Structure 1
Amino acid sequence: SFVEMVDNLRGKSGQGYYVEMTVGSPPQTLNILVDTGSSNFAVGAAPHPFLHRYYQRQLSSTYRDLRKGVYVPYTQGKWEGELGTDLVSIPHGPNVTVRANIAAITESDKFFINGSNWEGILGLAYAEIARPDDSLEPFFDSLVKQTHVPNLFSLQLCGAVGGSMIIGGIDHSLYTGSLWYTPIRREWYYEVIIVRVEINGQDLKMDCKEYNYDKSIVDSGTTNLRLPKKVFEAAVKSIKAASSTEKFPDGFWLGEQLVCWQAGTTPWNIFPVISLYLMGEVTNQSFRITILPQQYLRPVESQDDCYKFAISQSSTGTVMGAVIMEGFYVVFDRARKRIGFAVSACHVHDEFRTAAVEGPFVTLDCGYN
């Protein structure tokens, strides 16, 4: 109903945002990771060193085994298991219950995270990247087909963890400024197009096709801003440059090690802002999201302040992870093939620089084919 949905996501810093859900009759309560970079609904369905609870199909008078197996590889970990359907509802979501495909995770490899407090994954992307193939209708597609929930969801992910997932519409009480929309290039991943990248106003000077080699995606279930080999080296080089007045292990830039400062004395100001120019809704029109250092230096667990560098290389294209999403209010407007960004209530405060969604701007394409 909306207020009912605000603050429906928890997580522990750096381990992923989950929403509560229920599967089966009687209802079984599970914490489910919100993942826009995939398309399978899947829950642990067997004991595991990291699972404090799981799905027990036999205890469901509504479970229908589909007799198929399923394997899902992510960048990070992987799992396989048993396909089936069941009844699913979201306590602090809309007031509906839907029959949806469920993958019962029977074994997994580096998937579950110790102390993460979630036990499954909600893949909110399109059917074209469902496993085993696009015949396996994704939870959200079931939701819209089986009910009146509009084809739309929004994600307010908070840092410094909580946030909100508004299913079915836009809660205006949760963002300021205006919504800026970028076209979903193609309905598989949420694919978007980056037309320009700026660091403290310096242009990276690359052919805009490089920012999107071989795709750019918006993915609530990846931690980092991930950048293509070329773009990444160029960005690091500029962030290193602008902060060389300090010392870092040269593995810190690969994320393997931390940097520390004493409480309240982090030199935030020597870390540059990053600006991503996303393609607009009209010809030759952009807009930008600006990303503060408080966003790409993730705070990591003595009473010193320590940070991981949360920008990493990728060779499967750009991924606008939690790093990028945490500032902003993000609208996945499926009905209109577009992704909106506005600044969030829980945005990063700093008495000098602000994260912002701003525009319009102009340019003269940038997609990889």
Structure 2
Amino acid sequence: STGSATTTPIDSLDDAYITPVQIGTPAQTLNLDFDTGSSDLWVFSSETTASEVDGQTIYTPSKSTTAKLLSGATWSISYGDGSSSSGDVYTDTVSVGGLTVTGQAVESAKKVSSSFTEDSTIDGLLGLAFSTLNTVSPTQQKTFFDNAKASLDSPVFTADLGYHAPGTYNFGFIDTTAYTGSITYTAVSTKQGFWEWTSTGYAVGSGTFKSTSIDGIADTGTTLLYLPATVVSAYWAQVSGAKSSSSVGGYVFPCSATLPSFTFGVGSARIVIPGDYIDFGPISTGSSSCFGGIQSSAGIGINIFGDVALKAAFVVFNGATTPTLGFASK
């Protein structure tokens, strides 16, 4: 089997992407944030604290003839930005782009952090990291991908995120028309439960490539590119007037600037992030200070290849017995 679904930015900055997902019988379509950095499929629901729901579409398990309470199961998750959610668990039929999993754990939120409440466009998250990170207790649950894997034509999914435009998540096949050149594959460590890999270096604009190993995770659920302070300083030093602002919470730059590109290495291959992808716009409405799309990972504890990086590539998440990650230009 295969599936193919379009993913759409939630706003004009590509702050996140939402993908429609069918849950239950009859189908209830919710728009979920597909998240290769976590492993829980959770939704706003009829059980979510009412004051914490603000425009989201909710899953109502009592209206699904295939929903079943997973008795005794609870979940609770915290993301690296401080966002969180928790609740109980149902199993139900879940379909993405024509690919159907029966008995999928659908984690119903009883509580969500304000950061989720305020995102009216995001009805929940669909985790695509390794199932070892799943937070359901006392019986850990499998991701949608893990459940689908054996039925898929090939045990892979691909992320093809757009810049200020829709893109595609495919399951079970590689669309050879969706990228240019060849796909370069690189090793993955699953020890921490993430799609963790090692970039071979970087370049700033038209500068020379610096060969250096940068361990990080491929995280579709993180907006920006978080890299070591040395790398990030080297980038922003090429933008007149750019500076790290403690009050704002990262690097800002004059909105009048033209940003240089940023290149990262994948083996001997190179992925180029155009400068425009690194512009996250005014820090507040009407400001001439703009927020940068490349930020320091210092104090996160891990480097994160988020959407800024991933949307410059066609990315293969290869879930074979020994997982790997593939990147192609597009």
TM-score after normalising by structure 2: 0.85
Q: How does 1:269-308 map to 2 (within 5 A)?
A: 271-278=259-266, 280=267, 286-299=268-281, 307-308=290-291
What's the counterpart of residue 259 of structure 1?
254
What's the counterpart of residue 237 of structure 1?
233
Q: How many angstroms apart in 2 are the aligned matches of 1:178 and 1:249?
A: 37
Q: How many angstroms apart in 2 are the aligned matches of 1:174 and 1:25?
A: 33
CA contact (8 A) 2:244 2:250 kept: no
Q: How many angstroms apart in 1 are the aligned matches of 2:233 and 2:251?
A: 17
Give the 3 Å change call, closer, same or farther, for CA 340–103 of structure 1 in structure 2.
Answer: same
Q: Which amino acid is the alignment partner of residue 62 of structure 1? A: T
Instruction: List runs of 5+ in structure 2 lacking aligned partners.
Output: none
What's the counterpart of residue 39 of structure 1?
39
Q: How many angstroms apart in 1 are the aligned matches of 2:76 and 2:290?
A: 34
Q: How many angstroms apart in 2 are the aligned matches of 1:205 and 1:340?
A: 19
The secondary structure found in structure 2 opposite 1:178 is coil
- How many percent of aligned residue pairs carry the same amino acid? 25
Give the 3 Å change call, closer, same or farther, for CA 250–312 of structure 1 in structure 2.
Answer: closer
CA contact (8 A) 2:217 2:305 kept: yes
Q: How many angstroms apart in 1 are the aligned matches of 2:119 and 2:243?
A: 28
The secondary structure found in structure 1 opposite 2:234 is helix
What's the counterpart of residue 10 of structure 2?
11
Q: How many angstroms apart in 2 are the aligned matches of 1:135 and 1:160?
A: 36
Q: Is the aligned partner of 1:190 residue 2:176?
A: no
CA contact (8 A) 1:63 1:84 kept: yes
Q: How many angstroms apart in 2 are the aligned matches of 1:86 and 1:287?
A: 42
What's the counterpart of residue 86 of structure 2?
80
CA contact (8 A) 2:203 2:209 kept: yes
Q: Which amino acid is the alignment partner of residue 306 of structure 2? A: G
Q: Is the aligned partner of 1:174 residue 2:173?
A: no
The secondary structure found in structure 2 opposite 1:81 is strand
What's the counterpart of residue 63 of structure 1?
67
Q: How does 1:342-353 map to 2 (within 5 A)?
A: 342-344=328-330
Q: How many angstroms apart in 2 are the aligned matches of 1:276 and 1:256?
A: 19
What's the counterpart of residue 323 of structure 2?
337
Give the 3 Å change call, closer, same or farther, for CA 113–14 of structure 1 in structure 2.
Answer: farther
Deviations 1:302-360 (A, max 9, x none): 8998742012222321100000011111111112521111112xxxxxxxxxxxxxxxx
The secondary structure found in structure 2 opposite 1:107 is strand
Q: CA deviation at 1:220?
A: 0.4
CA contact (8 A) 1:94 1:167 kept: no
Q: Is the aligned partner of 1:164 residue 2:199?
A: no
Q: CA deviation at 1:294?
A: 1.5
Q: Is the aligned partner of 1:312 residue 2:307?
A: no
Runs of 4 or more off by more than 6 Å in structure 1? 301-306
CA RMSD of aligned residues (A): 2.8
The secondary structure found in structure 2 opposite 1:99 is strand
Give the 3 Å change call, closer, same or farther, for CA 139–52 of structure 1 in structure 2.
Answer: same
The secondary structure found in structure 2 opposite 1:323 is helix
Q: How many angstroms apart in 2 are the aligned matches of 1:179 and 1:205?
A: 20
Q: How many angstroms apart in 2 are the aligned matches of 1:182 and 1:323?
A: 19
Flag the structure with larger Rg: 1
What's the counterpart of residue 103 of structure 1?
107
Q: CA deviation at 1:202?
A: 4.3
